[PDB]
């Protein structure tokens, strides 16, 4: 019966742990102990963007490194030009409880979702000057927590019914589902090649997923509490995570182990977002105590601090030319650092 | 400013005007969150408040003395709620409904009250408490078959308050029962408070016609007490 099944499972877990333990000859810090530091790094705020009425809950930058989108619970989406602080679009929603947004890589569409369990897709470039809903995807059984386009035809979602799905916009129907997680799925990150992706859940676990097969390829388990954020290192061979135990960590895909830990004893608040830099050297993170931190990714050092918000920091991101960082908080303000 | 500069400026200024009209309607309306279990009668309060007029959430609108209230009810979620609850950190009030004649599930309702009261993003929000189904409680107490102190051992040592109000000529036994169950929730709300939020209890049943007036009065008190704090230095 199930007693034997569980005993076999425990044996296989012992085998996996020993297979990983045989591979641990060196530590990253021993390899990098002969390296110069980066010194102190100091950033300043160039623009402050004003206009929302309630807490800002998500944002996303554009491939065109100039334009931006952001979402707020008063029920609005705004599209900004960040060189001039000069609003381009403002869009009113049907439900006020939104939690995610995303640009398409071509600048033709934006998307959003939230507490009603639907994904809605907006078309900006119509012959009409107006902006109207094109699609409403309607099959999930819990709220929508993240979202990322892949092209103008296909989109990937994660929800609070503990599944992720891949969707076909022109037809409207799901094409594949990913089911193995146990708690809510909180984030999601696409690969540079768009053939793999990773996710982390309200369960101290991350999984690597194959888009085209619809299967799980690997599982990574190092944290203590719910994982709130996740992202890929630039060459496609690594990823970093941050959770409610107030730690960030770096995992490697080929070695199949945890590789570096970034923490401190004075930090006892959870982490809301993480983000990498363009050469991979700086890892930037956001926290519940109103500030953001800058770590050297190779040394577990603490090379900088960004301050200036009054309420919880909820979102953060870096552009494709690597020039500037954008942050958003429960203040209802957005800020650009460089 | 050339062509593109001026056109982009004129466009962002029209957007500014429309956002100005939106701000006013947003600020003249009050949001409420409705909570309770399924053996509680929450929907009947929802229906009595309709004469004032496969989804994940439901809304009902009502108006009293020319003021507007929006009440929000959650349906079609899983039973784990430590994440979506955070969306509600800035409602005017929470409304908690309880089936008061069900002795066998009251400790679970008390645990719900404690978790809501002590959360980090919900610690400046006030609660209006409805103690529903009073005719059933009356019938049970008079019938004499079941006992409170089988579930709550300290009822043997309870005496009615002095400022109780048994006006309609009801039995003293029903009055002890009513006030004991009320004092249980008021003990939790006074233990860990800090002065930034309060609780407002009411006794009710299924044929009451006057719950919108009670909600009106309690929100008036809440908003006045908030005014006193934000504007000590005006």
């Amino acid at each position, epitope marked *: 019966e199930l007693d034997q099944l569980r005993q076999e499972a425990e044996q296989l877990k012992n085998q996996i742990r020993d297979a990983r333990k045989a591979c641990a000859d060196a530590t990253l810090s021993q390899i990098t102990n002969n390296i110069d530091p980066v010194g102190r790094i100091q950033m300043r705020t160039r623009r402050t963007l004003r206009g929302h009425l309630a807490k800002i809950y998500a944002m996303h930058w554009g491939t065109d490194s100039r334009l931006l989108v952001s979402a707020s619970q008063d029920g609005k989406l705004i599209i900004w030009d960040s060189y001039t602080t000069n609003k381009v679009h403002a869009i009113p929603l049907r439900s006020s409880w939104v939690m995610t947004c995303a640009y398409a890589p071509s600048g033709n569409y934006v998307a959003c979702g939230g507490l009603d369990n639907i994904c809605s897709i907006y078309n900006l470039k119509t012959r009409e000057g107006n902006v109207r809903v094109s699609r409403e995807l309607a099959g999930h059984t819990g709220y929508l927590s993240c979202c990322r386009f892949l092209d103008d035809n296909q989109i990937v979602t994660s929800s609070g019914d503990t599944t992720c799905a891949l969707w076909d916009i022109e037809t409207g129907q799901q094409t594949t589902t990913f089911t193995g997680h146990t708690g809510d799925v909180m984030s999601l990150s696409l690969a540079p090649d768009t053939r793999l992706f990773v996710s982390g859940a309200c369960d101290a676990s991350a999984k690597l997923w194959d888009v085209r097969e619809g299967m799980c390829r690997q599982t990574f388990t190092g944290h203590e509490s719910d994982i709130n954020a996740i992202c890929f290192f630039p060459n496609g061979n690594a990823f970093a995570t941050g959770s409610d135990d107030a730690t960030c960590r770096l995992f490697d895909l080929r070695a199949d182990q945890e590789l570096m830990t970034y923490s401190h004893d004075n930090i006892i608040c959870g982490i809301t977002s993480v983000s990498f830099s363009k050469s991979g050297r700086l890892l930037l993170a956001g926290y519940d105590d109103f500030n953001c931190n800058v770590w050297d990714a190779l040394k577990a050092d603490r090379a900088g601090v960004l301050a200036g918000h009054d309420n919880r920091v909820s979102c953060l991101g870096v552009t494709d030319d690597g020039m500037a960082v954008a942050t958003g908080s429960w203040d209802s303000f957005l800020k650009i650092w460089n | 400013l050339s062509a593109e500069d001026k056109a982009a400026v004129e466009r962002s200024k029209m957007i500014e005007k429309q956002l100005q009209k939106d701000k006013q309607v947003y600020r003249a309306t009050h949001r409420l969150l409705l909570l309770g279990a399924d053996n509680s009668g929450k929907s009947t309060i929802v229906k009595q408040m309709r004469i004032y007029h496969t989804s994940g959430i439901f809304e009902t609108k009502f108006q009293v003395d020319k003021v507007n209230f929006h009440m929000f009810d959650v349906g079609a979620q899983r039973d784990e*709620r430590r994440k979506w609850i955070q969306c509600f950190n800035d409602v005017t009030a929470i409304i908690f409904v309880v089936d008061s004649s069900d002795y066998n599930r009251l400790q679970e309702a008390l645990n719900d009250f404690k978790s809501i009261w002590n959360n980090r993003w919900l610690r400046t929000i006030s609660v209006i408490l409805f103690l529903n189904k009073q005719d059933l409680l009356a019938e049970k107490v008079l019938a004499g078959k079941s006992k409170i102190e089988d579930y*709550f051992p300290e009822f043997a040592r309870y005496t009615t308050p002095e400022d109780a109000t048994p006006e309609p000529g009801e039995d003293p036994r029903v009055t002890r029962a009513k006030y004991f169950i009320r004092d249980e929730f008021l003990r939790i709300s006074t233990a860990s408070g800090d002065g930034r939020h309060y609780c407002y209890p009411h006794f009710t049943c299924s044929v009451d016609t006057e719950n919108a007036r009670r909600i009106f009065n309690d929100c008036r008190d809440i908003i006045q007490r908030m005014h006193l704090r934000q504007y000590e230095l005006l």
Partner: nanobody
Amino acid sequence: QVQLQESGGGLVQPGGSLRLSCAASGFTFSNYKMNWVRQAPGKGLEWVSDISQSGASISYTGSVKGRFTISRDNAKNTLYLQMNSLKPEDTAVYYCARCPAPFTRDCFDVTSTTYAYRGQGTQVTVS
């Protein structure tokens, strides 16, 4: 990997006594608040008892308030419950539960149907 393994159950005649223990692994034991829950035949999950980070504040449900006792040991990573006078109504499965986050006062979702930081359970039969 977070693990909680709980043991001590079995068959008792009414009026007897019993002791249960949990061994924890995979988290820093002392930042967390700990709980005991149980499930009887034909019902749902029900909250039994409660202890906080240091052991100073304790809490019990109404029907076991004079009979059961809860304690913890942070140097051995262990949790304990002791049960003194058992009744036929105590026949159930017992589970050991953890609070979701550290340094926190509220305790959400610990009796839900699926929950990630709960163990496998132990059977207790009184007759």
